[PDB]
């Protein structure tokens, strides 16, 4: 089957005009459309039939079709335009999408994580398990490294960590879960969650409660 390829990522400085390209076999003999998808959101049609905007879509969205290439153009780019952008083409018989282009808007301020570490609930402990929860929110850029300590020693099993995911305010979130027995938890004086973000480390510590 035919492919529609898009750049997997595009970066633009604020106020400049984003350009997102779409190409495949025969795209100039076809109509191109484009969709904006924000995190946690349904797609939104921004351009159809190469270069028409639906009512409601701003004029700073433009589309063109030449060569074997469709191109989506966004002027006055700001951070609230960060999103996945999908080209699409019919004709034909089938409906082809592109793999999507991630639109990075540069110049967003670095933001350190708010971290919150939680001890197991009394209830879970009566249920004869234990779960430590490390919540990492509002950080930018979206890379964190997360380490766990029992007292002063690293924990090398029982750790479950999410990758970072873009919150609707363009900052990032992550979580990490350390599973233990009540005994393991009660042994040590404390557990720590250690999150390192862009060279700097935030650490939190809880203890059994007694």
């Amino acid at each position: 089957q035919s492919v529609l390829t898009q750049p997997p990522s595009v970066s633009v400085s604020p106020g400049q005009t984003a350009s997102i390209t779409c190409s495949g076999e025969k795209l100039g003999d076809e109509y191109a459309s484009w969709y904006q998808q924000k995190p946690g959101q349904s797609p939104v049609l921004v351009i159809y039939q190469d270069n028409k905007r639906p009512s409601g879509i701003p004029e700073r969205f433009s589309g063109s079709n030449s060569g074997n290439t469709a191109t989506l153009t966004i002027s006055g780019t700001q951070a609230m335009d960060e999103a996945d952008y999908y080209c699409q083409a019919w004709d034909s018989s089938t409906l082809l999408f592109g793999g999507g282009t991630k639109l990075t808007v540069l110049g967003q301020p670095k933001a350190a994580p708010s971290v919150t570490l939680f001890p197991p609930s009394s209830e879970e402990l009566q249920a004869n398990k234990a779960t430590l929860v490390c919540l990492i929110s509002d950080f930018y850029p979206g890379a964190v490294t997360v380490a766990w300590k029992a007292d002063s020693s690293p924990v090398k099993a029982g750790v479950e960590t999410t990758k970072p995911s873009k919150q609707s305010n363009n900052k990032y979130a992550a979580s990490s879960y350390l599973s233990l027995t009540p005994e393991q938890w009660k042994s040590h004086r404390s557990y720590s969650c250690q999150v390192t973000h862009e060279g700097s480390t935030v650490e939190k510590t809880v203890a059994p409660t007694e």
């Binding site: 089957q1 459309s33 969709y35 998808q37 349904s42 797609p43 939104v44 049609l45 159809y48 039939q49 639906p54 999908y86 699409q88 019919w90 018989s93 089938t94 409906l95 082809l96 999408f97 592109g98 793999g99 999507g100 919150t116 939680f118 001890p119 197991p120 609930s121 209830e123 879970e124 249920a127 779960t131 929860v133 919540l135 929110s137 479950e160 960590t161 999410t162 995911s165 979130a173 992550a174 979580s175 990490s176 879960y177």
Partner: protein
């Protein structure tokens, strides 16, 4: 105005069958092309199928051809997607969308094709201690999604629900927390409302200091 509302999502076994619906209003249904577009978690969009105004003709993507059946009922303003011989590849959020160029979209229902059992989450309070963070752990469930809210919907600001983890056990776990003035911890109650439709798990849980 334009309403596209879906149903029918959930867990299904490989080789099993499942039917999705899309209930529509706000526009003259029988005049529009409709179709389905799906999106597997953290991956890209893919056309599934489309169907003419009259329902007299259909088109399919190669990967679902033979296995899916799109149909419509123009009197009840409903779109269907019969899904048979399900394969793990069919696991995706399924989007309802109107017309030649997908100009309106539903919110999507998630379909999960696995051999595995549903499992209800266990839900535990996450206790705190200026500001204080209290929260709820939604542990060990399958498949997605869960909904979490606070004080039966009433509490909405300061509320953050985290994306889940897929543990190597193949179960999910997630949390949701709420920031509150610490002073209010004495004179205000907090209960998290957690729903997991595929296992009929509904839980309330107070979070106390």
């Amino acid at each position: 105005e334009v309403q596209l509302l879906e149903s029918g999502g959930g867990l299904v076994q490989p080789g099993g069958s499942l039917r999705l619906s899309c209930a529509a209003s706000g526009f003259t249904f029988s005049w529009y092309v409709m179709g389905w577009v799906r999106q597997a978690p953290g991956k890209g969009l893919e056309w599934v199928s489309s169907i003419y105004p009259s329902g007299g003709a259909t088109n399919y993507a190669d990967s679902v051809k033979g296995r899916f059946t799109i149909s419509r009922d123009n009197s009840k303003n409903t779109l269907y997607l019969q899904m048979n011989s399900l394969r793990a590849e069919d696991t995706a959020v399924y989007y309802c969308a109107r017309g030649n160029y997908f100009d309106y979209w539903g919110q999507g229902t998630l379909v999960t094709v696995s051999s595995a059992s549903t499992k209800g989450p266990s839900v535990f309070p996450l206790a705190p201690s200026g500001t204080a963070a209290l929260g709820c752990l939604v542990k060990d469930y399958f498949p997605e999604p869960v909904t979490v809210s606070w004080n039966s919907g009433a509490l909405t600001s300061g509320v953050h629900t985290f994306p889940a983890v897929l543990q190597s056990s193949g179960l999910y776990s997630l949390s949701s927390v709420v920031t509150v003035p610490s002073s209010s911890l004495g004179t205000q109650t907090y209960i998290c409302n957690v729903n997991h439709k595929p296992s009929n798990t509904k839980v309330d849980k107070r979070v106390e200091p």
